[PDB]
Design a protein around this ligand. Sequence first.
Ligand SMILES: CC(=O)N[C@@H]1[C@@H](O[C@H](C)C(=O)O)[C@H](O[C@@H]2O[C@H](CO)[C@@H](O)[C@H](O)[C@H]2NC(C)=O)[C@@H](CO)O[C@@H]1O
Length: 616
Amino acid sequence: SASKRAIDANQIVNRMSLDEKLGQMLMPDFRNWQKEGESSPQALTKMNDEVASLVKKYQFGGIILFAENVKTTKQTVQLTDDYQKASPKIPLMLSIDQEGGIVTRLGEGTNFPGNMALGAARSRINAYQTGSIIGKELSALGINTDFSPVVDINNNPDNPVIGVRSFSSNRELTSRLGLYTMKGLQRQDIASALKHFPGHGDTDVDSHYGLPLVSHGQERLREVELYPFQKAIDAGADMVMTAHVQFPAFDDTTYKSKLDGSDILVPATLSKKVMTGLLRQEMGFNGVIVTNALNMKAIADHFGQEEAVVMAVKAGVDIALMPASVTSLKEEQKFARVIQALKEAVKNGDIPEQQINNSVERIISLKIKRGMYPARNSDSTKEKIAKAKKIVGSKQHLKAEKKLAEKAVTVLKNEQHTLPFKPKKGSRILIVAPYEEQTASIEQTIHDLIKRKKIKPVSLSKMNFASQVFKTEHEKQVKEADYIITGSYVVKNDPVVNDGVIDDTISDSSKWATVFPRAVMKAALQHNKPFVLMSLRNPYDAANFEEAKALIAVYGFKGYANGRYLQPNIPAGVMAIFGQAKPKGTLPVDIPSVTKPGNTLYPLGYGLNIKTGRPL
Ligand SMILES: CC(=O)N[C@@H]1[C@@H](O[C@H](C)C(=O)O)[C@H](O[C@@H]2O[C@H](CO)[C@@H](O)[C@H](O)[C@H]2NC(C)=O)[C@@H](CO)O[C@@H]1O
């Protein structure tokens, strides 16, 4: 099969002109479009003849879709069908960032609790079924490529840039879950891309040249960052997406910035040493290498979008993502100029022509392997739409989402059997969180439990604390409550701490993200109120609540708006609090102590049984 796949791809590439070949290596977006006569772009939700004409002219290898383009199942199937009608010779790779959790694009699909939640749920089977469900939805929609999984390792709490998009701080847990997410997508014939190579998880905090910098030496990079990429590559990864990050330990090449004329270190995307020497040769990856988005401001500014395409191709990449930003026919020639720059590089010998042929063969082999080519589907658009409506966001998928999110909830403290809350009729629950959307999600979850007669009728009060200070009016609310649920949101956990003592005296609204919830905790404890803290994003804030009797993490923070839950994590937490779910989560990261700096407060793998109060 793979043998036959390669001969086939070779015959196809041998017949293509250079224009057709360079076309395959481009993957633009058409997020917004401004038609002739229009004064401004608007979201592209349906095909028009202007966009179709550029797809026909330049013969792109693919299109990346964004949320603007995929708002409903009906519109999306119509759009992917019309994109493919405009690309009949070689079907397009139609791609998307459908990661789950905090990065999703589908307007009507299943969101999932995200990677760190999968880390917390631990099982490779859960990651596989998640990738499998995402893959089923994408496939029904006519989307055939997913830029997932993230296999970046979030191992530095002091710079958690990938954060909940990462499975874990541990290389093996990240590797395992990445591998099975990828197998799950591929099982549904979705091309999967590992990202972001060679590892975006731990960049230098004081990066100050616009491109993130990783200062670690090769031994550490080979032992940690590269490890889940290697495992997945050997298990048959289709694609790898680059990181626009400097790695001096592998390439110290500089270029003269077009932004300020200074010498700038090359990012991994434009490094032959990383793309060819390390990924292609040393790690033996022969699948498709795709750049991270070339419109990222620092690439465009330091290198120029057009010249970056040429440099990335020279470095050994196969697909340039978003190689030019074209939003109307007035700027179509941006595409012609990109092609022309690649032609000049081939003509003058900067890029050997055989390198181009080899890259397009990788692309065509992948399209064949994942059943993108040849296309022999005889269903009408209407028929595909009806099929997709049964699959996308189906209640079966939503049930899986719910059970995964509930499974991932991690109980860090439950002293004195504080949880579950079992309120008597007439209890007042005070619900406190940074935003109205978050308090609404908690409120709506409790309301549903009441209508479902799972808990007795209770009164609810909400307290939204972003930018606020806890004062006498808030303490009054705490005193009047019978149960308190508080949500905490941090990226980096940054309380003011002195010699291991957290500062509670900050009374002017500054530092609210840590000061306010702690103040609610202190009042509740002072007034003997059942109090639970729910960590909403990065779980490092658990370290701020050692005095609390009940503490959980849900690893996702988006709330409820326009009758819709934006993420399932918060409802999963509330369900656990009221004894209607079985949390089984264990930490996928270490949580550093703030009161004893340098010590781990809660280690990787820690999590309690909510019933027995004992560790899992
Ligand atoms: C709001 C927005 O779109 N910002 C983008 C970046 O995307 C963010 C990070 C996002 O939506 O997740 C964009 O980042 C890259 O975009 C690629 C394609 O959408 C992603 O596949 C990729 O994962 C993402 N890179 C990272 C490290 O997250 C960025 C270019 O890097 O340009 C805008 O800022």
